[PDB]
């Protein structure tokens, strides 16, 4: 399979162009659009990379196009660990979908946060807030694909199945790629010497929801998460040999680019994914 990487939450992790030119990632999720819904003005946060206000982040279009020409699919990640992002109603879902279309997809806007580049899709990283209307948002976004260009739909649900926020949305069967987060969740993550919980969790995710492919989400380094880190050798010799048996196996997802560099994770596991 391939590796999906999250980019954008640390200005020292390099440009999007450099990130994709490493030839180690097949998918890149731009994190994050952490503010929207309930009447709020949508706002993107790319840490120290750029300031979105006044088109300060429109330069990212160069990276987006550079990645795409390399066959890499780039999605705008909604949510994240921090943010007042939410959906107050089904109408709110429609408004946000149209916003995303005109500002990040095939629509039109005089203030597209990341430039004129057309992202490949939208990533759902909803970890808190509203538990409703996310399935509506998925449906509305998906409906836009009928205009000519496919709007990819991906999701980063917590490993505890089913996911409290993305369960209904994933039940629609509209998602192409689902990278489950097997960390920051003791019941379904790796523990020194024990891979039972993560494997048992993987079996539940691959034998339920209907999506294109399912990925194994992990922290790129011990510092990347509070818990759940899996040493490269363990992943390679114990975990990958098992999860890769599933026909739905898509590969591995990593948080994040910054921590991948400091730990050299993808460089160690790439070929085994």
Ligand X SMILES: CC(=O)N[C@@H]1[C@@H](O)[C@H](O[C@@H]2O[C@H](CO)[C@@H](O[C@@H]3O[C@H](CO)[C@@H](O[C@@H]4O[C@H](CO)[C@@H](O)[C@H](O)[C@H]4NC(C)=O)[C@H](O)[C@H]3NC(C)=O)[C@H](O)[C@H]2NC(C)=O)[C@@H](CO)O[C@H]1O
| Paired tokens of 258 | 């910054």
Query: Are 228 and 190 contacting, i.e. CB atoms less than 8 angstroms apart?
Result: yes
CB of 231 to ligand X, least distance (A): 17
Closest contact distance (angstroms) between CB of 36 and ligand X is 12
* Distance of closest approach, residue 229 Cβ to ligand X, in angstroms: 10
Question: Among 225, 235, 239, 252, which residue sits at the site for ligand X (rule: CB under 6 A)?
Answer: 225
10 forms part of the interface with ligand X (CB under 6 A): yes
Q: Residue 12 Cβ, how far from ligand X at the closest point, in Å?
A: 6
For ligand X, the binding residue among 4, 9, 201, 206 (CB under 6 A) is 9
Q: Build a one-symbol-per-residue string for 145-184: x at contacts with ligand X by CB under 6 A, - elsewhere.
A: -----------x------------------------x--x
Closest-CA residue to 174 (of 128, 129, 122, 126): 122
- Count of chain residues binding ligand X (CB under 6 A): 21
Distance (Å, rounded) from C-alpha 130 to C-alpha 239?
33
Contacts of residue 24, defined as CB under 8 A and 6 or more positions apart, other chains included, come to: 3, 5, 266, 267, 270
Q: Please state whether 133 falls in left (phi above 0), alpha (psi between -120 and 50) or beta.
A: left
**Which helix or strand (DSSP H or E) is residue 75 part of?**
strand 73-79
What is the 8-class DSSP label of residue 137?
H
**Does the protein bind ligand X through residue 134 (CB under 6 A)?**
no
* Residue 263 touching ligand X (CB under 6 A): no
Closest to ligand X by CB, 53 or 143: 53
Site map (CB under 6 A) of ligand X, residues 29-48, x = contact: ---x-x----------x-xx
Which residues form the interface with ligand X (CB under 6 A)?
9-11, 32, 34, 45, 47-48, 80-83, 125, 127, 156, 181, 184, 224-225, 255-256
């Amino acid at each position: 399979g391939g590796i999906a990487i999250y980019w954008g939450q640390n200005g020292n992790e390099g440009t999007l162009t450099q990130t994709c030119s490493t030839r180690k990632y097949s998918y890149v999720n731009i994190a994050f659009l952490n503010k929207f819904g309930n009447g709020q003005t949508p706002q993107i946060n790319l840490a120290g990379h750029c300031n979105p206000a006044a088109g300060g982040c429109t330069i990212v279009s160069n990276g987006i196009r550079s990645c795409q020409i390399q066959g890499i699919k780039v999605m705008l990640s909604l949510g994240g660990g921090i943010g007042s992002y939410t959906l107050a109603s089904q109408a709110d879902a429609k408004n946000v979908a149209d916003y995303l279309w005109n500002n990040f997809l095939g629509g039109k806007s005089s203030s597209r946060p990341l430039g004129d580049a057309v992202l490949d899709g939208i990533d759902f990283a909803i970890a808190h807030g509203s538990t409703l209307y996310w399935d509506d948002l998925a449906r509305y976004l998906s409906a836009y694909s009928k205009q000519g260009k496919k709007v990819y739909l991906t999701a980063a649900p917590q490993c505890p199945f089913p996911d409290r926020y993305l369960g209904t949305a994933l039940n629609t069967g509209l998602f192409d790629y689902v990278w489950v987060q097997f960390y920051n969740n003791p019941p379904c993550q790796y523990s020194s010497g024990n891979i039972n919980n993560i494997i048992n969790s993987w079996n539940r995710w691959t034998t339920s929801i209907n999506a294109g492919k399912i990925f194994l989400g992990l922290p790129a380094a011990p510092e990347a998460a509070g818990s759940g880190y899996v040493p490269p050798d363990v992943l390679i010799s114990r975990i990958l040999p098992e999860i890769k048996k599933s026909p739905k196996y898509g590969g591995v997802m990593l948080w994040s680019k910054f921590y991948d560099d400091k730990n050299g994770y993808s460089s160690s596991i790439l070929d085994s994914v």
